[PDB]
Design a protein around this nucleic acid. Structure first.
Length: 228
RNA sequence: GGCCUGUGUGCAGGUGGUGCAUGGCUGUCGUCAGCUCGUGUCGUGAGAUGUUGGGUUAAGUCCCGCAACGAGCGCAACCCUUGU
């Protein structure tokens, strides 16, 4: 099953990898040809793995599951956040707090405090406290809001995790593999293929490629959720 | 029965000993800013992380970074006096 054409991936800059000094040697089965110090990824393998990943995510969300959108690099932050908000899944955009999946019982209390803070703001009580403590509450609210945005709606813990640039986000993929959750990720030439259960070859550093692939998986989630 | 006088019987009474058996109270490092815990992670383990780095402060005071996220006893505040 395919959604985006080989030519769309070609002019989207999806086959451009990193240099020949940083490649993970396990990606010799993805890398297709070397041209001018850039490793070029195999598009046929890309679409075979895209078929596999699409089937997996569709099955998961059609059974009633959640897909975590994880992105920290500036190229993927805005795109991932926008598409996750538009479809209705939890997302991570700014920074991954260590121990959010494997330690949810603790970080969920921070979400409870976010509920409490927003609820006490909605009551409108401002001048009933110290005018310094109110400011401290406001920056505390800003911190929690900028830290936890999709996990705010997430609650009942994820079913699969979709991550961009595994190499940057090693903490998330490690926690997911520790919990036994399958990992869906985009892989550049410097990302280990063995630590991703459902890999999609791709370029992580380009905003065009990031947006295209992550919106592909968002569309998959949308169709599967509609299939519920 | 209240009451003491007696003879005894228990017994009282010990500023007698051990602060190297103790409780309680107090000095001291020092009113110095530090000391820890929960869950998570790393290590076979003792343990480490957090509490490290940059900046700032009277201060582990606070901000920004970070496999950590929080919390407690401390700092500050609430109390009295003095200045309008």
């Amino acid at each position: 099953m395919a959604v985006v054409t080989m030519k769309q991936l070609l002019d989207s800059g999806a086959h451009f990898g990193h240099q020949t000094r940083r490649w993970n040697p396990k990606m010799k089965r993805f890398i297709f040809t070397d041209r001018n110090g850039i490793y070029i990824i195999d598009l046929q393998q890309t679409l075979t793995y895209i078929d596999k990943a699409y089937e997996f995510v569709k099955e998961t969300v059609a059974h009633g599951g959640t897909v975590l959108f994880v992105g920290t690099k500036k190229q993927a932050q805005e795109s991932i956040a926008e598409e996750a908000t538009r479809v209705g899944m939890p997302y991570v955009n700014q920074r991954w707090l260590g121990g959010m999946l494997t330690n949810f019982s603790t970080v969920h209390k921070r979400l409870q405090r976010l509920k409490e803070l927003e609820a006490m703001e909605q009551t409108g009580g401002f001048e009933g406290r110290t005018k310094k403590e109110i400011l401290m509450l406001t920056r505390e609210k800003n911190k929690l809001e900028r830290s936890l945005g999709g996990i705010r709606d997430m609650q009942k813990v994820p079913s699969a995790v979709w991550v961009v640039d595994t190499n940057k986000e090693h903490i998330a993929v490690g926690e997911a593999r520790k919990l036994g959750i399958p990992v869906i990720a985009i892989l550049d030439t410097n990302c280990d293929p063995d630590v991703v259960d459902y890999p999609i070859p791709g370029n992580d550093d380009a905003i065009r490629s990031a947006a295209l692939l992550t919106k592909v998986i968002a569309s998959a989630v949308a169709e599967g959720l509609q299939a519920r």
